[PDB]
UniProtKB/Swiss-Prot annotation, chain B:
Superkingdom, taxonomy of origin: Viruses
Entry function: Attaches the virion to the cell membrane by interacting with host receptor, initiating the infection. The major receptor is host ACE2. When S2/S2' has been cleaved, binding to the receptor triggers direct fusion at the cell membrane. When S2/S2' has not been cleaved, binding to the receptor results in internalization of the virus by endocytosis using host TFRC and GRM2 and leading to fusion of the virion membrane with the host endosomal membrane. Alternatively, may use NRP1/NRP2 and integrin as entry receptors.
Subunit structure: Binds to host ACE2. RBD also interacts with the N-linked glycan on 'Asn-90' of ACE2. Cleavage of S generates a polybasic C-terminal sequence on S1 that binds to host Neuropilin-1 (NRP1) and Neuropilin-2 (NRP2) receptors. Interacts with host integrin alpha-5/beta-1 (ITGA5:ITGB1) and with ACE2 in complex with integrin alpha-5/beta-1 (ITGA5:ITGB1). May interact via cytoplasmic c-terminus with M protein. May interact (via N-terminus) with host bilirubin and biliverdin, thereby preventing antibody binding to the SARS-CoV-2 spike NTD via an allosteric mechanism.
Region of interest called Disordered, as start-end residue ranges on this chain: 27-49
Protein name per UniProt: Spike protein S1
Natural source organism: Severe acute respiratory syndrome coronavirus 2
Length: 50, 49
């Protein structure tokens, strides 16, 4: 997530793992998903769990 | 107080529907822009695009 002047940028990517360890090796570039034109300041963020 | 609004009253007493369009800026960058018309494009020719 990025908080540029007037577009909250969002990037996403999905890759398999097939193993049980720390973050795997190799590069995986995330692609832009939505611009979300908003002018609201953002300094704190939280995670939504179910 | 309530109006009469009968179809027999003159123009000075007839009801009118008014729509006001207020424009704002400096809040969000370019959220409501006007109609951007376009033209049919061609190829294999030197044309401005
Ligand atoms: C948001 O950030 C802008 C740019 O730094 C600043 O001018 C403005 O006062 C900030 N607003 C709030 C509510 O923090």
């Amino acid at each position: 997530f990025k908080n540029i002047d007037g577009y909250f940028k969002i990037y996403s990517k999905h890759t398999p793992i097939n193993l049980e360890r720390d973050l795997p090796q190799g590069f995986s570039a995330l692609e832009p998903l939505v611009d979300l034109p908003i002018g609201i300041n953002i300094t704190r963020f939280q995670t939504l769990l179910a | 107080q309530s109006y009469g609004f009968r179809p027999t009253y003159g123009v000075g007493h007839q009801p009118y529907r008014v729509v006001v369009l207020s424009f704002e800026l400096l809040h969000a960058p370019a959220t409501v822009c006007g109609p951007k018309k376009s033209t049919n494009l061609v190829k294999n020719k030197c044309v401005n695009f």
